[PDB]
Design a binder for this molecule. Structure first.
Ligand SMILES: [Fe+2]
Ligand SMILES: [Fe+2]
Ligand SMILES: [Fe+2]
Ligand SMILES: [Fe+2]
Ligand SMILES: [Fe+2]
Ligand SMILES: [Fe+2]
Ligand SMILES: [Fe+3]
Lengths: 170, 170
């Protein structure tokens, strides 16, 4: 594990840089596919995976990867931070500055993070006992990120998108 | 598109936050799989997607998504910055502080970004003319992220990984 202050800071910045590059490429791949460039989209997705490898490598060097129970905990804290601190404030700020678009994206994220924090809490209770959670599939709204396990509402409670549009993980 | 300075800054911060959460979850998912928790891995992957939706929303709100040619340009500039500026410096600093692990992770990323920059350049020249790129498959080394198109090398020149370890994108 890296211990020197400056190098740790640099690896942290590189992890953030790699994460954003990976994210942009997933976004670009989707856009390229919609524009009629399937091979360019394929290129973006592959490189996005390469950035995942870079990010994971820095992540491990910082010694931030642990066992599932500990990983779920990192998740619980991050989600909880976004629910109680970050998004409420960013949302209130956007409201205050009249940026309706930002008011919407932060509202979208916030409601979903509330669900994430809870699912991770339930999951840890299991993992911590050496047990896997019992879930068949997960629904994710492609519009606002609303998340549902096993059973989904007919329409997204946040944006109202029909269930037919939810991305399914099974 | 969001214009106010503070809200714009907050959305850029949220984009970074969502990107890193997305990444940590993809990393945690692979770990959960390796530890024997396939359902928890499923949850991590599903939620990773939800964070992609959130980041995509902020990114679009910030007005950073354009047509494929322009998106490739953003990629070219990002990769070039990492190749010419960021990684050579972080790598040198890591070496100077004797953090061998970081020397390795920054070197792995560096060699790969050099390839990425060139590939996006090639792709853009085609996209500019309304043409897709002529690539059938893309191989990615799961160890260092080394990237090769159409054919995988006998062994990864960067980390030494055998050809059979490459992840294929077709
Ligand atoms: Fe990278
Ligand atoms: Fe979340
Ligand atoms: Fe929704
Ligand atoms: Fe999120
Ligand atoms: Fe790259
Ligand atoms: Fe490699
Ligand atoms: Fe990168």
């Amino acid at each position: 594990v890296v211990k020197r202050t400056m190098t740790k800071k640099f690896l942290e910045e590189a992890f953030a840089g790699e994460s954003m590059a990976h994210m942009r490429y997933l976004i670009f791949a989707e856009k390229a596919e919609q524009e009629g460039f399937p091979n360019i989209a394929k290129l973006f997705r592959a490189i996005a995976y390469a950035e995942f490898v870079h990010a994971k490598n820095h992540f491990i060097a910082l010694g931030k990867l642990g066992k599932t129970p500990e990983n779920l905990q990192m998740g619980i804290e991050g989600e909880t931070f976004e629910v109680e601190e970050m998004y409420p404030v960013y949302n209130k700020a956007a409201e205050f500055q009249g940026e309706k678009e930002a008011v919407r994206t932060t509202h979208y994220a916030l409601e979903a993070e509330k669900i994430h924090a809870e699912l991770y809490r339930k999951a840890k209770e299991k993992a911590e006992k050496g047990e896997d959670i019992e879930i068949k599939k997960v629904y994710i709204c492609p519009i606002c990120g609303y998340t549902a396990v096993d059973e989904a509402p007919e329409y997204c409670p946040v944006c109202g998108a029909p269930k037919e549009k939810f991305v399914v993980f099974e």
